[PDB]
Design a protein around this ligand. Structure first.
Ligand SMILES: Cc1ncc(COP(=O)(O)O)c(CNCC(=O)O)c1O
Ligand SMILES: Cc1ncc(COP(=O)(O)O)c(CNCC(=O)O)c1O
Ligand SMILES: Cc1ncc(COP(=O)(O)O)c(CNCC(=O)O)c1O
Ligand SMILES: Cc1ncc(COP(=O)(O)O)c(CNCC(=O)O)c1O
Lengths: 331, 332, 331, 332
């Protein structure tokens, strides 16, 4: 089965599984789980921050992050297509009583600071209270330019705004930068790390920031239902992935780039390729038919007028070649 | 004192006051106040709708309106510069647990239906549940084209979305249309009426829609703190304004149009005028200075790089001419 | 028409009306209404507090008050039968994201401090954050003992809790105390004043506390929809009532006490009488019939197995005597 | 290390671990994980209900449950000491916009229906809208009498109220009843199952009810952050526990009962024992000292004036005897 629906579909490797079953656990609510502590300590150190916490999903990681930054009546500026506004059911507004202020991102995935400044509300009773700027890196595969990350950092400091980045695929960005995570994370107050995607764990995300911030995050994680007990078995997979699965993300990027070439040669309208993602403009007429066509040959895609293809450790170039041939035959 | 800050600054006429003090009242919570009932019934009748309720402010009118349309987890599509998203402290999200979906309005004040359709969320657990489209008419004075109001009404029917319009200045649009309120209101499920602006009452707004909708709205008005007792004394001004102050809104429109002509001649950068509003592009350097200059001559404006001037029944053309002369002197 | 449903049914006197129509107004949002300012300044001075604001209803006064005291996730301890928990549709929870912690009040209308202390949550992620103690005075007519008001004040200070009192009928308490409002309000951080009841205005309530507190209250009043424009016409009635209608509340108390005597003589089960309220235990069998019986003779009551009778400036003893005679005939 | 803090501290057996690592997984968001589906289908089948969902915690299971039962402005009647009111940071009110109506439970852990009826709000705009009655079984170890569960189910039908039970320790009750889960679960619309306690899994709870209810619950689980991917590896432990660790809960009950007997003999004030829990009245002066005394001998308790001791598969009777000896020495 060839699955290009997302990098979320990754399955645990055997070495990862062996690490999961061998790890010492405890009750994380009591803070007694040594493996969860180790993962959190390692993630904080690796990113140059004071503290971190384990969460079941990236969705809760952002929900807890927004709650920890923004009070009732406060507002976060965010991308119209950003996950913690668009793809989390409006949790920040619905559950958190937080005003979302979405704006269109630039082509490079960046939220233009000139547009952000126009959205910063004056201290007047008619407006919500602008408190947070939320970024996404990578955003649909796109690696935000390093120069912007600095500019956004200084800007938020000058405007007394917090800066959070959704780093569900921040390690995809890191190897695209060719730098250390530390050199990127310095330009944010808090950020997330998804472990259950490209890094290939079955479950888990990380929220990392300063000590007092994370302390509040522990309260909100509890209320939202993320306070697990012996979650060290999951954290074990996270530790393994951070130490073994970061560098090999380059393979996913090369594969996606390779796949874009093959579909371009096959006559498909490849819109763009970024890291481990590639977007093909299939016909609205052809969308449903392509999905069914691929499904019949045991290839799984999310059928859509614009199809997103996502590479990961559970899809090789040999498998990509098979899909590309099916796509070619389809056209 | 010349006040061009807003039409909210309007004060009660002698006749409006005499109507307030003569009006029969009761406890509105028990529904025993004959004057607000009369106002609500009259507003519903005038708009071809089933029911209406009196509210203390237009802000609550919209807050209650969004609460009544959208459940927890549901979403309303709205303008980035629209009032019930931008100028009400985000109440719908903060108090109502409603996801806001703002989009840029077109130059004519309309929310382009092609972008609205792109913002309608699929029935998937990742998205909020799109339920409502909210419009604003007038929007910063701008009168929405009638053809769009029909198109938007039809569009929402096709997508099974509700349609609410912020009609704080809907009567300004009505006389600009030259039609009846009903002929505009037919293109929405619910809409608001502000009474405390151009119509010139001290307090009050109306929310009007169908019977079941308004019944839910009564529950939300109670929770938000708008369930008043003898508000008939306030409603009386509303009845008077609906019957006496609608036609003369043309005066405010002509004044704004005249002032725009006058300010252009005085050397000011007049950007646009729509109904009873006028927008001048003043220097950021000159913004604060102009305000202070005008304040020292008993003229009140909201000092800003872009100044919004709003005409109303408490500012005459003679007064506009006086202000225009001060503006001319300021630019010399 | 004789109306004993509530003191809310009071209608403006002519002198009050003449004051309403003569008062100077402005836009309160801009803070330009001199009459609203005068009322707020007078109420703050009279209560020994720094600031006050005008609101459309007592319900919003409490909703705004709870919002201004309690953040998202914080908790207020309150009576099970208290208005800002029971009779405001759960606004604090539904709109304000505030945990209510209701407890049974004592017979005297007091919330026992030993029970309050047991409800103060430890600083643990499993619990909401206890922040506020809310009192009600009067509570169903009952005047809370002065000694308790002090004890509750010291207790909340020692426990670092805020103390709010619903003073919708606090002036009924004041004349029952025979003291000044100032001597009662010293034992709270914030409190409310309803003007549209016994004081007899058509519309209005007041929220009064410290300067920073009220500043936050202005923001929440805006969001909740209480930011009126030329509300000076309503505030004018408030000023008149504070200066003319406080002392005469004694008449309402004497009338209610007199009425309790008459119904007791007529064979009705009068449960208790407090200030301008009295509660009669009519049959559940007789409840609907009594309501209809009184309605036919142009007497309005809230028909119920326990009927609450409320006196006010629009009901005299001559009218009370008529009702008592109807009640006597009914039995 | 002797841990009597809670049954949450249970660790995976070798066989449970081997089941986890052998289990087929997929993306649960896409619904492609065969093991959680198997667990959910099995839990629904076992309880005579239509559907079930896997959740990371019991807290989210209840939060999602209340969200799915009660809309914004609606109310759930619940115990003052109940978990989904007291021990979940008030999530239902804070996140869910749900009015909580707590009442004191009776000594037997039941919410007396006469007080419940007194808390059911009339359909009036002054009140929240009573919609749900939430129970807890077991409640601090206490097994709710079967007759009450039937009475409460019937009562809620008559009042058109929903009935949810917090069944974090429902299987402890089941073996205490000596009946089948179905025979208990029939008296509710929805209920929860914690897997990470007495059943001994590292992570997981279940929410089970009817198809439409659970479908709504899936939306709320997503928003609250419980929509995991390959959680089948976690669900595998749940399947193992349901099939192997239910009957042996009797062991925990006998242990707690034995410990209560043993501690009474040692001179401790044993207040009560119910299923796998035991409550001792220690001095407030001795509370902190006892904890430190036990901690220094590798015995973990939650030091408190009233100490809750909880037995589980990771504490033997031999270990209980050791602790009882330390307690005896402490009191001498
Ligand atoms: C940028 C980003 N942020 C947050 C999340 C949320 O992660 P969870 O699914 O673990 O909650 C996702 C997953 N989005 C779906 C996908 O890309 O396939 C994401 O892509
Ligand atoms: C279009 C619109 N809608 C709603 C409101 C809110 O009404 P209240 O302020 O009475 O709540 C206003 C007033 N907005 C401020 C102004 O234009 O001066 C408005 O202009
Ligand atoms: C103690 C108390 N507090 C607050 C309120 C709310 O006031 P509004 O009705 O102005 O919102 C009331 C009115 N309660 C209804 C009655 O006693 O008749 C009340 O009695
Ligand atoms: C009855 C009950 N319900 C729900 C929960 C919440 O489960 P999670 O902690 O897995 O979210 C607990 C655990 N309460 C803490 C204890 O008894 O140790 C509980 O005892």
């Amino acid at each position: 089965m060839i699955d290009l629906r997302s990098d979320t579909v990754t399955r645990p490797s055997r070495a990862m599984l062996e690490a999961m079953m061998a790890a010492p656990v405890g009750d994380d609510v009591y803070g007694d789980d040594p493996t969860v502590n180790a993962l959190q300590d390692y993630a904080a150190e690796l990113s140059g921050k004071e503290a971190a916490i384990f969460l079941p999903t990236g969705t809760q990681a952002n929900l807890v992050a927004l709650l920890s930054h923004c009070e009732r009546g406060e507002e976060y500026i965010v991308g119209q297509a950003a996950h913690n506004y668009l793809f989390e059911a409006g949790g920040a507004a619905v559950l958190g009583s937080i005003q979302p202020q979405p704006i269109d991102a630039a082509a490079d995935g960046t939220l233009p600071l000139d547009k952000v400044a126009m959205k910063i509300k004056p201290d007047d009773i008619h407006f919500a209270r602008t408190k947070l700027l939320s970024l996404e890196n990578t955003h649909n595969g796109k690696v935000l330019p390093r120069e912007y990350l600095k500019e956004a950092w200084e800007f938020t400091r000058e405007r007394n705004l917090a800066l959070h980045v959704d780093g569900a695929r921040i390690f995809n960005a890191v190897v695209a930068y060719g730098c250390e995570l530390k050199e990127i994370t310095q330009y944010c107050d808090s950020f997330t790390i998804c472990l259950s995607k490209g890094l290939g764990t079955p479950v888990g995300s990380l929220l990392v920031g300063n000590r007092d911030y994370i302390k509040r995050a522990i309260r909100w994680r509890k209320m939202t239902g993320g306070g697990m007990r012996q979650s060290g078995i999951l954290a074990a997979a996270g530790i393994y992935a951070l130490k073994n699965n970061v560098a090999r993300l380059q393979e996913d990027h090369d594969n996606a780039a390779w796949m874009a070439e093959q579909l371009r040669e096959a006559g498909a309208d490849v819109m763009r390729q970024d890291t481990n993602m590639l977007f093909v403009r299939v016909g609205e007429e052809n969308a449903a038919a392509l999905g069914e066509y691929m499904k019949a040959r045991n290839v799984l895609i999310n059928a859509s007028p614009i199809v997103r293809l996502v590479t990961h450790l559970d899809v090789s170039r040999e498998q990509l070649a098979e899909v590309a041939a099916h796509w070619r035959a389809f056209l």
